[PDB]
Design a protein around this ligand. Sequence first.
Ligand code: MTE
Ligand code: MTE
Ligand code: SO3
Ligand code: SO3
Ligand code: MOM
Ligand code: MOM
Lengths: 373, 373
Amino acid sequence: QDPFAGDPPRHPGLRVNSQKPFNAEPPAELLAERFLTPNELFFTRNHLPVPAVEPSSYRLRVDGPGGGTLSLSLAELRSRFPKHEVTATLQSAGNRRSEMSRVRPVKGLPWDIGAISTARWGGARLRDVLLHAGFPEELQGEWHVCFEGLDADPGGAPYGASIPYGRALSPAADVLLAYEMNGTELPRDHGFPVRVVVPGVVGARSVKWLRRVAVSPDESPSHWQQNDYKGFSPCVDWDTVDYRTAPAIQELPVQSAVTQPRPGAAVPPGELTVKGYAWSGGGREVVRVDVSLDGGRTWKVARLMGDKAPPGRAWAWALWELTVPVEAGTELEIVCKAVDSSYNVQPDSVAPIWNLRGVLSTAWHRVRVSVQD
Amino acid sequence: QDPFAGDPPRHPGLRVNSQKPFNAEPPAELLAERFLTPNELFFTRNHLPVPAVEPSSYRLRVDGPGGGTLSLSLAELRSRFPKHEVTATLQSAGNRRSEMSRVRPVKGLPWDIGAISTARWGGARLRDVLLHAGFPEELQGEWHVCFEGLDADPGGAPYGASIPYGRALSPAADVLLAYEMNGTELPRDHGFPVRVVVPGVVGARSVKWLRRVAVSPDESPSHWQQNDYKGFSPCVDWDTVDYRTAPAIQELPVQSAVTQPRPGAAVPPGELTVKGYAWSGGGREVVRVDVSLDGGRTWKVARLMGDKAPPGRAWAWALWELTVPVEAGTELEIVCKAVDSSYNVQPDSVAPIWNLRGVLSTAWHRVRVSVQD
Ligand SMILES: Nc1nc2c(c(=O)[nH]1)N[C@H]1C(S)=C(S)[C@@H](COP(=O)(O)O)O[C@H]1N2
Ligand SMILES: Nc1nc2c(c(=O)[nH]1)N[C@H]1C(S)=C(S)[C@@H](COP(=O)(O)O)O[C@H]1N2
Ligand SMILES: O=S([O-])[O-]
Ligand SMILES: O=S([O-])[O-]
Ligand code: MOM
Ligand code: MOM
């Protein structure tokens, strides 16, 4: 019967948008409590039943340059390659989808602002694993590294995704084959025993339950690389959608949201502490977060907290707070917007960035609250 | 007397915002006529009098790793290093400044939409020149490559700027010491005999009339790297400005403007061809340009023309056109917005991105025209 009966159990407090397959986000109240999202609260995005993997008999398959196959046990992956730790934010393409649906309904999981989490990942460098397999530093022309998961649909197609070969081999890009998450082994929901982590790139490419790495002249031929996770114009309908026309999403644009306080809340007069997160793709650092209480007319600069990465390697979000005076018996529209190190900014409104898939939702986050007497 | 008497003569048709020092842009009607901006129309940004350089006695000074100096004539730079051609768009930080001034006056040259041009640059790779000087591929920690121009103020401080060491040494980043522009020698206004060209980065760093390259633990100590060309919050005043707080601008965000038709124009009924440019920093390709005639309510996808670069090396703008039906006796608000390969977008309005320096002006360009009876 149930194809999902072997799924792991989860922490009780989550905002679950789908039980089967399991897709949940942490309550926004907890999301920015901590710089590293605890493993139990880390948002979970599963397309399929969670694989049950016996650790000893697991083998990761890596296709070598000549068409032969290298085969790696969990123990080999731990012992043969220097462990590297990378703190990276994973964000779903559809984070903040629900705000986009308010304009015009979209297809997809109705994510609120918490389809984003941060962990310290430990594992083998993908670069080292490929050099070990025999691949050079540089292949000429345009190449991609395909990943397949152990999870498959009833008809047998695995979850798959790819990244450009150059990113796979770059020391600076920090692409990991991770077996470790916030210092413990990878939880089942997060890809036990091995997942790719692609810093600075949409979560879709961080393939969980990794069963194969292949180098190819093209992208992953899988449905989710070729006919999904792509952004379109505000005009594109379902009968006119053309996935050949847009690039697969890799790097994500600058993003931010307010996590404290929550919409509709009553706040005590005097002082309010507004908190949130901000993040940008491509290793671009968040350099500023502006916060408004008057719906986006005046702004003040927030305080930023982060782990100060080297230029071009800002893989982790910035958490932000602003403590500001609030008067008895007023309504506030709390708004936040972030600015990255290439000075990309977030757009004012959602309607002009609307799309049928509900991805890439990065317009200013607005939270309407009231102050008591 | 005149410190500017030796300045070169210019093409008569330019939009000159300053004669002394000379700062001009091409008429918007010509700007997107051609993919490569002709040398005579290429926008010109001079802080200072244009140096008069005798080609034979010119020497470029490169400080080696140990504190000695390498000295290179124009002939050596041409003969010792394989010439590399790079097609790159230079854009001023203050492009479209005048739209920002409409909200609240700013300090700076009142650029309209044409402080941007594209040329094929030929010259020595900066990377090769540094390897020749003895520098390694990688220095540990945070390093910068400083550039000084031959132009100096009356008190002797030269124009200077820097870029990160990693960009200087990257094969993929295409940083050139150029002596060639659209197939002819560099014109005086554009840096004869040698300029840096830093693809994907604000024009400020493409130091003209190059007289020195130095490698240093810090950025260029010059006024224009440390106390200018930095973006601030919509709230920052002149008495509260703090240049220690923001990153020097390097990569620029996604940008676009409508060049045809021009504001206020009358257009014949039936069909109108709207044209423009779009571009993004950091080698990020423009993947889509949306165009509106109704002030930003509905949109249609424009046709893109470009030189199809490898991923991450889209140094040149995209020109765009959309041919669309126009009805007798209506007013149109023509609006354009572009989307890059990291899916960064342009914000709706200018007020929320306002700053006292008038830089980073990338809100949607809006052109109001009428159609005749
Ligand atoms: N094998 C496999 N890997 C996968 C997925 C999946 O369904 N199967 N989901 C992808 C998507 S869409 C996202 S957003 C991230 C979510 O990872 P998390 O569950 O650790 O947050 O995993 C990616 N990797
Ligand atoms: N030596 C020198 N280099 C310089 C400048 C200058 O004043 N002196 N202006 C800088 C700025 S601000 C810009 S935008 C570009 C403009 O180059 P162009 O004149 O070729 O367009 O040159 C840069 N390089
Ligand atoms: O998260 S999915 O629905 O794009
Ligand atoms: O162009 S200047 O005035 O920033
Ligand atoms: O759907 Mo995955 O990018 O959340
Ligand atoms: O001022 Mo230079 O970036 O135009």
